[PDB]
């Protein structure tokens, strides 16, 4: 009986609950419940607030969990990413008033307001700087005008909120907030089950007809996750079938066309088990 | 320029934003903003997550704030309630498996999971008991089945979530979570302005005709917040006009009737300034 924790609420909830339904696990039979067991699949789900998720995967009271990477990058628990889930991903970073051109160097002796104080601190120690880290529970983009901080650190999502506070981001992302499946045989089955759901959400099938001399190029354009190559009666052609990432399927299709690919057809898939 | 903080999000937000609009202050002109200033009323609003609210009213970076009483009962900041706002009020308490009849005595050496660890701890010290307090960020009613705790402490709202986890509450409420206006002449004007909005939301006007000999009884049934008494040409009658609380206006009307009150009429009001 695998015990698995899932965000009970917030932005990582509906999407994580959907992924597991998509994989044939039972849903909770009410929304106020914080537990369901699936008799068929032998799992016991628990529904926790994302930040209590890493911790309890680290102390061993849970076999797996779903949280955001920023939380784990910030938890300090003994846990490891076993899977990138593809949703809620954004750059985590620093930002300060649109006045200047900031550097991570300008952080020395500043107060930085952030919801992920430990994450900021490890990073700073790493870059050789010392500054003052203040914890806030949210609404960080206001700490500079309330006069509590000099700069911030947060996930920059749409960026709107930033600019609306005349903050600008600056520096390499400190983390990427992606939902993640973490751990500390029935465990591989769960992993694969989950993975097949993700790959089905992140890739499409491309079927195209590619000229033999472009075979090489074609396959650097679509390596697929083992692409299929089926030589056509015309020695000068070969049918190719590959999974390609969905966010950039059009550019890819355009690439194919520029090298002589024909009948380019993109189609959805649901799961993969391979 | 009064600086005032308001929950940026969650359950205490829409209601607190409405109260202040109801009082003639400007609203933020977008929902991603965490600040607005009202040029007319001379105030600068800030929009913070409720728990960063008490703290910044205590360090003096904010003149007033709106949060929940459980937060302040749990903050430890130097702040005082200046006004009960009438919304989000529930009993805060302890609960454990519906097995037995618990006592606060049964808490000795248990682990208690709660989102308000300091609040639990002051209470325990107060009652002479020692136990182990664990912090969770939410979803506390699950800590007992995940096996992390033996009892919980939380706001019991509708109670559904409790019973759905076979927890039962037990003991006097440790706090009452009511939204509250906290502080550390333009300040009295703000207070009154806010208060007039609340009283308009919590009371109605009752106008009734009461017999002279029941005058005494009548006025213990409705003391109003200075009731009005206007003797009618008939010496045996006197018209009374009082504000009475809205949650229990029907029982009150029934009381009046039982003592001979006639033409009992309940009506809404919007604000009071008195
Ligand atoms: Mg294939
Ligand atoms: Mg009156």
From Swiss-Prot, chains A, B:
The keyword Iron does not apply. It catalyses: 1-(5-phospho-beta-D-ribosyl)-ATP + diphosphate = 5-phospho-alpha-D-ribose 1-diphosphate + ATP. Its cofactor is Mg(2+). Pfam families: HisG, HisG_C. It is an enzyme of class 2 (transferase). It comes from the Bacteria. Feedback inhibited by histidine. Also inhibited by AMP. It is found in: Cytoplasm. GO terms for cellular component: cytoplasm; plasma membrane. One of its GO terms (biological process) is L-histidine biosynthetic process. One of its GO terms (molecular function) is ATP phosphoribosyltransferase activity. The keyword Methyltransferase does not apply. InterPro entries: ATP-PRT_HisG_long (IPR020621), ATP_PRibTrfase_cat (IPR013820), ATP_PRibTrfase_CS (IPR018198), ATP_PRibTrfase_HisG (IPR001348), HisG_C (IPR013115), N-reg_PII-like_a/b (IPR011322), N-reg_PII/ATP_PRibTrfase_C (IPR015867). Pathway: Amino-acid biosynthesis; L-histidine biosynthesis; L-histidine from 5-phospho-alpha-D-ribose 1-diphosphate: step 1/9. Its main location: cytoplasm. CDD domains: PBP2_HisGL1. Keywords: Amino-acid biosynthesis, ATP-binding, Cytoplasm, Glycosyltransferase, Histidine biosynthesis, Magnesium, Metal-binding, Nucleotide-binding, Transferase. Its EC number is 2.4.2.17. Belongs to the ATP phosphoribosyltransferase family. Long subfamily. NCBIfam families: hisG, HisG_C-term. Equilibrium between an active dimeric form, an inactive hexameric form and higher aggregates. Interconversion between the various forms is largely reversible and is influenced by the natural substrates and inhibitors of the enzyme. Catalyzes the condensation of ATP and 5-phosphoribose 1-diphosphate to form N'-(5'-phosphoribosyl)-ATP (PR-ATP). Has a crucial role in the pathway because the rate of histidine biosynthesis seems to be controlled primarily by regulation of HisG enzymatic activity. PANTHER family: ATP PHOSPHORIBOSYLTRANSFERASE (PTHR21403:SF8), ATP PHOSPHORIBOSYLTRANSFERASE ATP-PRTASE (PTHR21403). This is ATP phosphoribosyltransferase. It comes from Mycobacterium tuberculosis (strain ATCC 25618 / H37Rv). The lineage of its organism: Bacteria, Bacillati, Actinomycetota, Actinomycetes, Mycobacteriales.
